[PDB]
Amino acid sequence: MKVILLEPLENLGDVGQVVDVKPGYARNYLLPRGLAVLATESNLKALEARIRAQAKRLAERKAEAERLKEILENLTLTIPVRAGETKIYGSVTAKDIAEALSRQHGITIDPKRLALEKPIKELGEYVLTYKPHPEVPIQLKVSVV
Amino acid sequence: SGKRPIVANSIQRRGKAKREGGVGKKTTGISKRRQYPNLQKVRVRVAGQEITFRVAASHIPKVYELVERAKGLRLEGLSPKEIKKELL
RNA sequence: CUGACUGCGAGGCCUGCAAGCCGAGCAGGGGCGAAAGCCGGGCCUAGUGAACCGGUGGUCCCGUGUGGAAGGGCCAUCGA
RNA sequence: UGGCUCUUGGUCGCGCCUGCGUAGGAUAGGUGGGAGCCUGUGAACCCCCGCCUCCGGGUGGGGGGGAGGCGCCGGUGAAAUACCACCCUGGCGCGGCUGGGGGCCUAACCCUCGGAUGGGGGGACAGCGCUUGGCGGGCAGUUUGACUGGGGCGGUCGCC
RNA sequence: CAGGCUCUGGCGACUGUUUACCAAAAACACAGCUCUCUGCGAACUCGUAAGAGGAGGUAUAGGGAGCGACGCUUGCCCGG
RNA sequence: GGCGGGACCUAAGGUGAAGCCGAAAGGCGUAGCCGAAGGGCAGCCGGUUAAUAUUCCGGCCCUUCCCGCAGGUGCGAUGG
RNA sequence: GGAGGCGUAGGGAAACCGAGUCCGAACAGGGCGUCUAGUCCGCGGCCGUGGACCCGAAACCGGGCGAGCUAGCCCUGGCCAGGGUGAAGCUGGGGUGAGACCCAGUGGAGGCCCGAACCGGUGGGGGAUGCAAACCCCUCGGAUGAGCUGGGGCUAGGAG
RNA sequence: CCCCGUGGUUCGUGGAGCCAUGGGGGAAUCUGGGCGGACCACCGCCUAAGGCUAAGUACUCCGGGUGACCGAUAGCGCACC
RNA sequence: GAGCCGGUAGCGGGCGUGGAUCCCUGGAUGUCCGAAUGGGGGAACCCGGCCGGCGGGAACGCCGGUCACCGCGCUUUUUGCGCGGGGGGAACCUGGGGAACUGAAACAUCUCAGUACCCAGAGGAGAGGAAAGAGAAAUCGACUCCCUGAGUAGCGGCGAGCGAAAGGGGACCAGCCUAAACCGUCCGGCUUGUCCGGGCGGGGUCGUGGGGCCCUCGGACACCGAAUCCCCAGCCUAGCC
RNA sequence: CGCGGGGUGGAGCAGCCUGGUAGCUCGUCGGGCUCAUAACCCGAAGGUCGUCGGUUCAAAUCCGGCCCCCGCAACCA
Ligand SMILES: [Mg+2]
Ligand SMILES: [Mg+2]
Ligand SMILES: [Mg+2]
Ligand SMILES: [Mg+2]
Ligand SMILES: [Mg+2]
Ligand SMILES: [Mg+2]
Ligand SMILES: [Mg+2]
Ligand SMILES: [Mg+2]
Ligand SMILES: [Mg+2]
Ligand SMILES: [Mg+2]
Ligand SMILES: [Mg+2]
Ligand SMILES: [Mg+2]
Ligand SMILES: [Mg+2]
Ligand SMILES: [Mg+2]
Ligand SMILES: [Mg+2]
Ligand SMILES: [Mg+2]
Ligand SMILES: [Mg+2]
Ligand SMILES: [Mg+2]
Ligand SMILES: [Mg+2]
Ligand SMILES: [Mg+2]
Ligand SMILES: [Mg+2]
Ligand SMILES: [Mg+2]
Ligand SMILES: [Mg+2]
Ligand SMILES: [Mg+2]
Ligand SMILES: [Mg+2]
Ligand SMILES: [Mg+2]
Ligand SMILES: [Mg+2]
Ligand SMILES: [Mg+2]
Ligand SMILES: [Mg+2]
Ligand SMILES: [Mg+2]
Ligand SMILES: [Mg+2]
Ligand SMILES: [Mg+2]
Ligand SMILES: [Mg+2]
Ligand SMILES: [Mg+2]
Ligand SMILES: [Mg+2]
Ligand SMILES: [Mg+2]
Ligand SMILES: [Mg+2]
Ligand SMILES: [Mg+2]
Ligand SMILES: [Mg+2]
Ligand SMILES: [Mg+2]
Ligand SMILES: [Mg+2]
Ligand SMILES: [Mg+2]
Ligand SMILES: [Mg+2]
Ligand SMILES: [Mg+2]
Ligand SMILES: [Mg+2]
Ligand SMILES: [Mg+2]
Ligand SMILES: [Mg+2]
Ligand SMILES: [Mg+2]
Ligand SMILES: [Mg+2]
Ligand SMILES: [Mg+2]
Ligand SMILES: [Mg+2]
Ligand SMILES: [Mg+2]
Ligand SMILES: [Mg+2]
Ligand SMILES: [Mg+2]
Ligand SMILES: [Mg+2]
Ligand SMILES: [Mg+2]
Ligand SMILES: [Mg+2]
Ligand SMILES: [Mg+2]
Ligand SMILES: [Mg+2]
Ligand SMILES: [Mg+2]
Ligand SMILES: [Mg+2]
Ligand SMILES: [Mg+2]
Ligand SMILES: [Mg+2]
Ligand SMILES: [Mg+2]
Ligand SMILES: [Mg+2]
Ligand SMILES: [Mg+2]
Ligand SMILES: [Mg+2]
Ligand SMILES: [Mg+2]
Ligand SMILES: [Mg+2]
Ligand SMILES: [Mg+2]
Ligand SMILES: [Mg+2]
Ligand SMILES: [Mg+2]
Ligand SMILES: [Mg+2]
Ligand SMILES: [Mg+2]
Ligand SMILES: [Mg+2]
Ligand SMILES: [Mg+2]
Ligand SMILES: [Mg+2]
Ligand SMILES: [Mg+2]
Ligand SMILES: [Mg+2]
Ligand SMILES: [Mg+2]
Ligand SMILES: [Mg+2]
Ligand SMILES: [Mg+2]
Ligand SMILES: [Mg+2]
Ligand SMILES: [Mg+2]
Ligand SMILES: [Mg+2]
Ligand SMILES: [Mg+2]
Ligand SMILES: [Mg+2]
Ligand SMILES: [Mg+2]
Ligand SMILES: [Mg+2]
Ligand SMILES: [Mg+2]
Ligand SMILES: [Mg+2]
Ligand SMILES: [Mg+2]
Ligand SMILES: [Mg+2]
Ligand SMILES: [Mg+2]
Ligand SMILES: [Mg+2]
Ligand SMILES: [Mg+2]
Ligand SMILES: [Mg+2]
Ligand SMILES: [Mg+2]
Ligand SMILES: [Mg+2]
Ligand SMILES: [Mg+2]
Ligand SMILES: [Mg+2]
Ligand SMILES: [Mg+2]
Ligand SMILES: [Mg+2]
Ligand SMILES: [Mg+2]
Ligand SMILES: [Mg+2]
Ligand SMILES: [Mg+2]
Ligand SMILES: [Mg+2]
Ligand SMILES: [Mg+2]
Ligand SMILES: [Mg+2]
Ligand SMILES: [Mg+2]
Ligand SMILES: [Mg+2]
Ligand SMILES: [Mg+2]
Ligand SMILES: [Mg+2]
Ligand SMILES: [Mg+2]
Ligand SMILES: [Mg+2]
Ligand SMILES: [Mg+2]
Ligand SMILES: [Mg+2]
Ligand SMILES: [Mg+2]
Ligand SMILES: [Mg+2]
Ligand SMILES: [Mg+2]
Ligand SMILES: [Mg+2]
Ligand SMILES: [Mg+2]
Ligand SMILES: [Mg+2]
Ligand SMILES: [Mg+2]
Ligand SMILES: [Mg+2]
Ligand SMILES: [Mg+2]
Ligand SMILES: [Mg+2]
Ligand SMILES: [Mg+2]
Ligand SMILES: [Mg+2]
Ligand SMILES: [Mg+2]
Ligand SMILES: [Mg+2]
Ligand SMILES: [Mg+2]
Ligand SMILES: [Mg+2]
Ligand SMILES: [Mg+2]
Ligand SMILES: [Mg+2]
Ligand SMILES: [Mg+2]
Ligand SMILES: [Mg+2]
Ligand SMILES: [Mg+2]
Ligand SMILES: [Mg+2]
Ligand SMILES: [Mg+2]
Ligand SMILES: [Mg+2]
Ligand SMILES: [Mg+2]
Ligand SMILES: [Mg+2]
Ligand SMILES: [Mg+2]
Ligand SMILES: [Mg+2]
Ligand SMILES: [Mg+2]
Ligand SMILES: [Mg+2]
Ligand SMILES: [Mg+2]
Ligand SMILES: [Mg+2]
Ligand SMILES: [Mg+2]
Ligand SMILES: [Mg+2]
Ligand SMILES: [Mg+2]
Ligand SMILES: [Mg+2]
Ligand SMILES: [Mg+2]
Ligand SMILES: [Mg+2]
Ligand SMILES: [Mg+2]
Ligand SMILES: [Mg+2]
Ligand SMILES: [Mg+2]
Ligand SMILES: [Mg+2]
Ligand SMILES: [Mg+2]
Ligand SMILES: [Mg+2]
Ligand SMILES: [Mg+2]
Ligand SMILES: [Mg+2]
Ligand SMILES: [Mg+2]
Ligand SMILES: [Mg+2]
Ligand SMILES: [Mg+2]
Ligand SMILES: [Mg+2]
Ligand SMILES: [Mg+2]
Ligand SMILES: [Mg+2]
Ligand SMILES: [Mg+2]
Ligand SMILES: [Mg+2]
Ligand SMILES: [Mg+2]
Ligand SMILES: [Mg+2]
Ligand SMILES: [Mg+2]
Ligand SMILES: [Mg+2]
Ligand SMILES: [Mg+2]
Ligand SMILES: [Mg+2]
Ligand SMILES: [Mg+2]
Ligand SMILES: [Mg+2]
Ligand SMILES: [Mg+2]
Ligand SMILES: [Mg+2]
Ligand SMILES: [Mg+2]
Ligand SMILES: [Mg+2]
Ligand SMILES: [Mg+2]
Ligand SMILES: [Mg+2]
Ligand SMILES: [Mg+2]
Ligand SMILES: [Mg+2]
Ligand SMILES: [Mg+2]
Ligand SMILES: [Mg+2]
Ligand SMILES: [Mg+2]
Ligand SMILES: [Mg+2]
Ligand SMILES: [Mg+2]
Ligand SMILES: [Mg+2]
Ligand SMILES: [Mg+2]
Ligand SMILES: [Mg+2]
Ligand SMILES: [Mg+2]
Ligand SMILES: [Mg+2]
Ligand SMILES: [Mg+2]
Ligand SMILES: [Mg+2]
Ligand SMILES: [Mg+2]
Ligand SMILES: [Mg+2]
Ligand SMILES: [Mg+2]
Ligand SMILES: [Mg+2]
Ligand SMILES: [Mg+2]
Ligand SMILES: [Mg+2]
Ligand SMILES: [Mg+2]
Ligand SMILES: [Mg+2]
Ligand SMILES: [Mg+2]
Ligand SMILES: [Mg+2]
Ligand SMILES: [Mg+2]
Ligand SMILES: [Mg+2]
Ligand SMILES: [Mg+2]
Ligand SMILES: [Mg+2]
Ligand SMILES: [Mg+2]
Ligand SMILES: [Mg+2]
Ligand SMILES: [Mg+2]
Ligand SMILES: [Mg+2]
Ligand SMILES: [Mg+2]
Ligand SMILES: [Mg+2]
Ligand SMILES: [Mg+2]
Ligand SMILES: [Mg+2]
Ligand SMILES: [Mg+2]
Ligand SMILES: [Mg+2]
Ligand SMILES: [Mg+2]
Ligand SMILES: [Mg+2]
Ligand SMILES: [Mg+2]
Ligand SMILES: [Mg+2]
Ligand SMILES: [Mg+2]
Ligand SMILES: [Mg+2]
Ligand SMILES: [Mg+2]
Ligand SMILES: [Mg+2]
Ligand SMILES: [Mg+2]
Ligand SMILES: [Mg+2]
Ligand SMILES: [Mg+2]
Ligand SMILES: [Mg+2]
Ligand SMILES: [Mg+2]
Ligand SMILES: [Mg+2]
Ligand SMILES: [Mg+2]
Ligand SMILES: [Mg+2]
Ligand SMILES: [Mg+2]
Ligand SMILES: [Mg+2]
Ligand SMILES: [Mg+2]
Ligand SMILES: [Mg+2]
Ligand SMILES: [Mg+2]
Ligand SMILES: [Mg+2]
Ligand SMILES: [Mg+2]
Ligand SMILES: [Mg+2]
Ligand SMILES: [Mg+2]
Ligand SMILES: [Mg+2]
Ligand SMILES: [Mg+2]
Ligand SMILES: [Mg+2]
Ligand SMILES: [Mg+2]
Ligand SMILES: [Mg+2]
Ligand SMILES: [Mg+2]
Ligand SMILES: [Mg+2]
Ligand SMILES: [Mg+2]
Ligand SMILES: [Mg+2]
Ligand SMILES: [Mg+2]
Ligand SMILES: [Mg+2]
Ligand SMILES: [Mg+2]
Ligand SMILES: [Mg+2]
Ligand SMILES: [Mg+2]
Ligand SMILES: [Mg+2]
Ligand SMILES: [Mg+2]
Ligand SMILES: [Mg+2]
Ligand SMILES: [Mg+2]
Ligand SMILES: [Mg+2]
Ligand SMILES: [Mg+2]
Ligand SMILES: [Mg+2]
Ligand SMILES: [Mg+2]
Ligand SMILES: [Mg+2]
Ligand SMILES: [Mg+2]
Ligand SMILES: [Mg+2]
Ligand SMILES: [Mg+2]
Ligand SMILES: [Mg+2]
Ligand SMILES: [Mg+2]
Ligand SMILES: [Mg+2]
Ligand SMILES: [Mg+2]
Ligand SMILES: [Mg+2]
Ligand SMILES: [Mg+2]
Ligand SMILES: [Mg+2]
Ligand SMILES: [Mg+2]
Ligand SMILES: [Mg+2]
Ligand SMILES: [Mg+2]
Ligand SMILES: [Mg+2]
């Protein structure tokens, strides 16, 4: 039998695969439990879709990655917000890091996809690491003051 | 019987016993006899309800292929036998 | 020494049919013999089996659109 | 018609090892090559381990050790004893193809339970389908001669 | 209206059963003995099948076989 | 209306929703339905006609159903 | 209406050749064939195929019809005068340590006895174009049983 | 499509193809696939596994026409209630 | 166009040129049984639901209507409503099953014979039908039926028997629609997708291979044409001269 | 016919692997021992190992053919 399984099994293999099994294992177990599925013509193609869809999808996102990657590199976010003589009056988060960016330019960016644990409370200039894609890191220059 | 997607009756075709060489001759004895189609039951789900098929061994797959086409189908309505029927 | 031949076969006996039997001489090619000539098994009359089906050897022949092959035919012989 | 696992066979490729009468110093399956071959592509003498046995040697894996080690002819047997090669007899380690045997499982299939989508027993067995060979007056179709001082029994059946 | 009796053999224990229409018996049957199959979806029977009987029974039960109350007994042979 | 049968019940059997089986015809089958000389159910004596009579008549006696009333009570079913 | 048929050339298994051709090395022999017939219609005699002059089986096979006779079972009802014998049990008495057991009474057992109905059909006579396609008279067997009998229903042809 | 078991055809297993198909294995989409009597090559023919379609054909319950058909033991079993 | 109230006279009593009887067409009515169909059942009988009516009429009875099962489709399951099936027909037809006598001078392969007969289905016919054909002609061109081919080619216990096709002569004459690629839309499902599937519409039908999509031709009014539809002629179902 | 495996002492078989090997039981004779057959113990004779050809240093052994008995199924117009 040809079958496309929807569940990893030490037996046959990881999900989305396509492996030959004796019809029985299919008909009277794998197929009805739903651990696997008759790999008809329709399904094989329904699997193309399932690939192509996310396949081109991710690449098209990574697109909008080299889009920001270029803008975010040739730029520094000057962040004017009151401060002592070293420490800050209050604090700057990614949320702020984000809005200042979306204002100071109009470039929108997810606050979360931005590496920064505790909010900045020091005065100075940094480079935080942004990440919309796990293969497209972006060093963002900044400057609280 | 024959019944399902199968489409196969049971043909009555004789079986003739012979004694022979082939390098000397070959002679006979002959009688009518009925050949049956290897035939099994197939149980399957299809929405609610079970549903069996008195199918031949040949087309066992056709039946599963049928349940696949049934997913694209709108059914229910307490249709035990009725599914099978409306199941093409 | 190998006529226990090959290719024939005028003409008859016998006989319902089928079969059985005797056979001069012709060609080929050969044996014995000085030669005349004799040799187509055994002094003779029993020691046998139609046809069909098939086997082995061969061979001008046939070979399903054509070339082969399969198979068959023909000659020889085999299994009552 | 299925899941897991142990176990074993055939067969092919690869790898590797076995097959010990005197003799030659020898316990050398075959045939042929070539005098040269090993060792730092770390050797001889020695400790540990697996396997074989003709009970001697043999071969594979771990160490000490250190540049030393084997062969040749003569000798000698039927053949030459380094080393390399194709291959044999028998066996071991890997994979390819392929089958036989045991065990367990459950979901097919089968039985069952005051409906159960379920639970319990059986279980890849059994049932059934195609195909194999067998047993097979339970049943079926037929056959079971002619002569013949009636038939049978007996005798005979063609050729000289 | 209404038994002739007795003695003594054979067969079969016994009441029963039977060849409607030439045979009522010494024939069958019988309680009883032995062998054998069958562990239950039993074996066996009818049916292509589903199914049914077996039995809504479970080896002290069910199928098949032979012998045939009861008493005494039932030897040897496993080559085919 | 009262006897017998039917507008009641169920037996063997038959039939047969569901379900199962079978080349066709068909075969099996739960419920249910059918199925009686079984269960259930109210009439006796006498008269009369050429010819009927628990059938007409006479006497005496009884059943079910519908409506209304009076009295009484949780009434109510193919289910227990 | 010329499709078509027969006839005009045979010999050979054929390849093939042709008044020849086959066998054969053969311009030996020999088989068969050359030196022409034919066809179409009517009629008659016979032959082949069909039932083939006519009438006749015992049988076989396919589909149906029958258990209102008879056989078995299933359901539900009915029937068996009268007489006889007198089992167990129980009661009582006897008996013994208790008991087995004994006797009497009571009791009403039985494919028990006699014998009608009813169910048979033993022997004889009769009947034999019968009263009758199985009867009649005398006689005889069973008669609470494995009894007989009404109504309902089931099983059948290689089947019951 | 090949194999096993068969049926059809003139074809009785035969050198047995073709059409069909009960069991088993099991493709391809025109550079595909079937066939021309085992097989192979060459050369041809043809496009399977969906379906429909008049007429020319068969029959005589029925009505009509006609006979070198019968004439009541013939002619249909029946001339007729 | 003169009679008439059948065969069928008689008792009794009517009708017809105000055109009867009679014949042709259409309509009406049509008890109960039968596919039989509300339910039952031993055909021609018995019992009942719902709605409306009849009688004094609630009990009873009668009348009119209506109520089997099965398939297909709308009905959302529902319960409905709508079209269809059921049964019969002499022979003929197709399909599923399918003998034996007999022949072979016995008999088993073989024959009789895919006949007899059983079953289902079709219909004025039925089947078959446009080539995955035939078969040797670098030919033919659906199917059916007749002649011939031919008692040939073959098949065969090479027995008994059985027995083609192509080709030629005639009858008739007709070709078509889908599946798939691709496009559009409606619905479902789901791992929301540039999807899967189901239905409906466009598209497409071939062997000189055809079709789809893309680009160029101009893409066209024209050209062909029903086997469906309408009307008419003709014809049949009474007559008349 | 093709398939298979053997012809070893007076009887067979082991030896035929994977060549370096004739031994077994009974039997014959002799000796020991017993009342005694016999049991038993010691010792000896009786095999081109069916046949011929070939490999090899060497065979019953591996190989060809042949001669024969046994067995296998399968065919007989
Ligand atoms: Mg499998
Ligand atoms: Mg500031
Ligand atoms: Mg300040
Ligand atoms: Mg902005
Ligand atoms: Mg963005
Ligand atoms: Mg973003
Ligand atoms: Mg990634
Ligand atoms: Mg079935
Ligand atoms: Mg099939
Ligand atoms: Mg069928
Ligand atoms: Mg067979
Ligand atoms: Mg052969
Ligand atoms: Mg034959
Ligand atoms: Mg026959
Ligand atoms: Mg037969
Ligand atoms: Mg299954
Ligand atoms: Mg079902
Ligand atoms: Mg298969
Ligand atoms: Mg689908
Ligand atoms: Mg429903
Ligand atoms: Mg429902
Ligand atoms: Mg349906
Ligand atoms: Mg629908
Ligand atoms: Mg002569
Ligand atoms: Mg003669
Ligand atoms: Mg002679
Ligand atoms: Mg003579
Ligand atoms: Mg002499
Ligand atoms: Mg003489
Ligand atoms: Mg013969
Ligand atoms: Mg011959
Ligand atoms: Mg030759
Ligand atoms: Mg010659
Ligand atoms: Mg040639
Ligand atoms: Mg040749
Ligand atoms: Mg041909
Ligand atoms: Mg040619
Ligand atoms: Mg050829
Ligand atoms: Mg030849
Ligand atoms: Mg030959
Ligand atoms: Mg298996
Ligand atoms: Mg060796
Ligand atoms: Mg040695
Ligand atoms: Mg020396
Ligand atoms: Mg070398
Ligand atoms: Mg050298
Ligand atoms: Mg040198
Ligand atoms: Mg070296
Ligand atoms: Mg080296
Ligand atoms: Mg060691
Ligand atoms: Mg060694
Ligand atoms: Mg040297
Ligand atoms: Mg060497
Ligand atoms: Mg592996
Ligand atoms: Mg392996
Ligand atoms: Mg492997
Ligand atoms: Mg295992
Ligand atoms: Mg287990
Ligand atoms: Mg368990
Ligand atoms: Mg379990
Ligand atoms: Mg479980
Ligand atoms: Mg199964
Ligand atoms: Mg269940
Ligand atoms: Mg279950
Ligand atoms: Mg379960
Ligand atoms: Mg289970
Ligand atoms: Mg278990
Ligand atoms: Mg087991
Ligand atoms: Mg099994
Ligand atoms: Mg036996
Ligand atoms: Mg027997
Ligand atoms: Mg037999
Ligand atoms: Mg026999
Ligand atoms: Mg017999
Ligand atoms: Mg016969
Ligand atoms: Mg005979
Ligand atoms: Mg005689
Ligand atoms: Mg005599
Ligand atoms: Mg006499
Ligand atoms: Mg005799
Ligand atoms: Mg003679
Ligand atoms: Mg008296
Ligand atoms: Mg008396
Ligand atoms: Mg007296
Ligand atoms: Mg006596
Ligand atoms: Mg007696
Ligand atoms: Mg006795
Ligand atoms: Mg009695
Ligand atoms: Mg009796
Ligand atoms: Mg009697
Ligand atoms: Mg009697
Ligand atoms: Mg009689
Ligand atoms: Mg009689
Ligand atoms: Mg008597
Ligand atoms: Mg008797
Ligand atoms: Mg008994
Ligand atoms: Mg006894
Ligand atoms: Mg037992
Ligand atoms: Mg039987
Ligand atoms: Mg049976
Ligand atoms: Mg049972
Ligand atoms: Mg029971
Ligand atoms: Mg018993
Ligand atoms: Mg005694
Ligand atoms: Mg005895
Ligand atoms: Mg004795
Ligand atoms: Mg014996
Ligand atoms: Mg024995
Ligand atoms: Mg024995
Ligand atoms: Mg009364
Ligand atoms: Mg009454
Ligand atoms: Mg009633
Ligand atoms: Mg009643
Ligand atoms: Mg009732
Ligand atoms: Mg009942
Ligand atoms: Mg039925
Ligand atoms: Mg049916
Ligand atoms: Mg029934
Ligand atoms: Mg009835
Ligand atoms: Mg009733
Ligand atoms: Mg009653
Ligand atoms: Mg009563
Ligand atoms: Mg009273
Ligand atoms: Mg009164
Ligand atoms: Mg009273
Ligand atoms: Mg009276
Ligand atoms: Mg009165
Ligand atoms: Mg109460
Ligand atoms: Mg309450
Ligand atoms: Mg109450
Ligand atoms: Mg000729
Ligand atoms: Mg001449
Ligand atoms: Mg002459
Ligand atoms: Mg001549
Ligand atoms: Mg001449
Ligand atoms: Mg002439
Ligand atoms: Mg003439
Ligand atoms: Mg003539
Ligand atoms: Mg003649
Ligand atoms: Mg003839
Ligand atoms: Mg005759
Ligand atoms: Mg004649
Ligand atoms: Mg004749
Ligand atoms: Mg009766
Ligand atoms: Mg009687
Ligand atoms: Mg009495
Ligand atoms: Mg007394
Ligand atoms: Mg006392
Ligand atoms: Mg007492
Ligand atoms: Mg006393
Ligand atoms: Mg006592
Ligand atoms: Mg006492
Ligand atoms: Mg007493
Ligand atoms: Mg007493
Ligand atoms: Mg008394
Ligand atoms: Mg008595
Ligand atoms: Mg008596
Ligand atoms: Mg009386
Ligand atoms: Mg009587
Ligand atoms: Mg009497
Ligand atoms: Mg009498
Ligand atoms: Mg008598
Ligand atoms: Mg008498
Ligand atoms: Mg008399
Ligand atoms: Mg008389
Ligand atoms: Mg008289
Ligand atoms: Mg009497
Ligand atoms: Mg008596
Ligand atoms: Mg009775
Ligand atoms: Mg009775
Ligand atoms: Mg009655
Ligand atoms: Mg009969
Ligand atoms: Mg019959
Ligand atoms: Mg019988
Ligand atoms: Mg019988
Ligand atoms: Mg083919
Ligand atoms: Mg097979
Ligand atoms: Mg086979
Ligand atoms: Mg085949
Ligand atoms: Mg057939
Ligand atoms: Mg055939
Ligand atoms: Mg034929
Ligand atoms: Mg044939
Ligand atoms: Mg054939
Ligand atoms: Mg085929
Ligand atoms: Mg098939
Ligand atoms: Mg084909
Ligand atoms: Mg062809
Ligand atoms: Mg060909
Ligand atoms: Mg073609
Ligand atoms: Mg085509
Ligand atoms: Mg196609
Ligand atoms: Mg087509
Ligand atoms: Mg077509
Ligand atoms: Mg077609
Ligand atoms: Mg048609
Ligand atoms: Mg005609
Ligand atoms: Mg007429
Ligand atoms: Mg006429
Ligand atoms: Mg006329
Ligand atoms: Mg006339
Ligand atoms: Mg007359
Ligand atoms: Mg007449
Ligand atoms: Mg007259
Ligand atoms: Mg007359
Ligand atoms: Mg008539
Ligand atoms: Mg008439
Ligand atoms: Mg009459
Ligand atoms: Mg009449
Ligand atoms: Mg008039
Ligand atoms: Mg009148
Ligand atoms: Mg009148
Ligand atoms: Mg009148
Ligand atoms: Mg009158
Ligand atoms: Mg009158
Ligand atoms: Mg008058
Ligand atoms: Mg008139
Ligand atoms: Mg008139
Ligand atoms: Mg009318
Ligand atoms: Mg009316
Ligand atoms: Mg009616
Ligand atoms: Mg109705
Ligand atoms: Mg009815
Ligand atoms: Mg009303
Ligand atoms: Mg009213
Ligand atoms: Mg009406
Ligand atoms: Mg009504
Ligand atoms: Mg129904
Ligand atoms: Mg329906
Ligand atoms: Mg509709
Ligand atoms: Mg519907
Ligand atoms: Mg609608
Ligand atoms: Mg709809
Ligand atoms: Mg509906
Ligand atoms: Mg609605
Ligand atoms: Mg609904
Ligand atoms: Mg309705
Ligand atoms: Mg309804
Ligand atoms: Mg409609
Ligand atoms: Mg119709
Ligand atoms: Mg019809
Ligand atoms: Mg047919
Ligand atoms: Mg058929
Ligand atoms: Mg016969
Ligand atoms: Mg005979
Ligand atoms: Mg035939
Ligand atoms: Mg037929
Ligand atoms: Mg039908
Ligand atoms: Mg019909
Ligand atoms: Mg037609
Ligand atoms: Mg058609
Ligand atoms: Mg086409
Ligand atoms: Mg025939
Ligand atoms: Mg004929
Ligand atoms: Mg013809
Ligand atoms: Mg033609
Ligand atoms: Mg033509
Ligand atoms: Mg004409
Ligand atoms: Mg045409
Ligand atoms: Mg769509
Ligand atoms: Mg659809
Ligand atoms: Mg479409
Ligand atoms: Mg379309
Ligand atoms: Mg179109
Ligand atoms: Mg187009
Ligand atoms: Mg086409
Ligand atoms: Mg193209
Ligand atoms: Mg376009
Ligand atoms: Mg334009
Ligand atoms: Mg255009
Ligand atoms: Mg059209
Ligand atoms: Mg006219
Ligand atoms: Mg008219
Ligand atoms: Mg006039
Ligand atoms: Mg063997
Ligand atoms: Mg021996
Ligand atoms: Mg031995
Ligand atoms: Mg030995
Ligand atoms: Mg000794
Ligand atoms: Mg000797
Ligand atoms: Mg020897
Ligand atoms: Mg010797
Ligand atoms: Mg012998
Ligand atoms: Mg022997
Ligand atoms: Mg053997």
Taking the CA of residue B87 and the nearest CA in chain A, the distance in Å comes to 18
A110 neighbors A75 (Cβ within 8 angstroms): no
Report angle CA A7, A10, A13 to the nearest 5 degrees.
55
Question: Per the CB < 8 Å rule, is A38 touching B60?
Answer: no
**Which of chain A's residues have a Cβ under 8 Å away from the Cβ of B44?**
32
Which DSSP category does A86 fall into? S
Neighbours of B42 (CB within 10 A): 21
Which DSSP category does A119 fall into? P
Label residue A18 left, alpha or beta by phi (over 0 means left) and psi (-120 to 50 means alpha). Answer: beta
Question: Residue A82 and residue A33: Cα distance in Å, rounded?
Answer: 63
B34 neighbors B12 (Cβ within 8 angstroms): yes
Nucleotide nearest to B13 (CA to C1'): H6
Which technique was used to obtain these atomic coordinates?
X-ray
Alpha helices in A38-138 (DSSP H): 41-73, 94-104
Question: Per the CB < 8 Å rule, is B65 touching A38?
Answer: yes
A22 neighbors A30 (Cβ within 8 angstroms): no
Question: Residue B65 and residue A37: Cα distance in Å, rounded?
Answer: 11
The helix, strand and coil proportions of chain B, stated in percent and rounded to the nearest 5, come to 20, 25, 55
How many residues are recorded in chain B? 88
- Backbone phi, then psi, for A24, in 5-degree steps? -50, -65
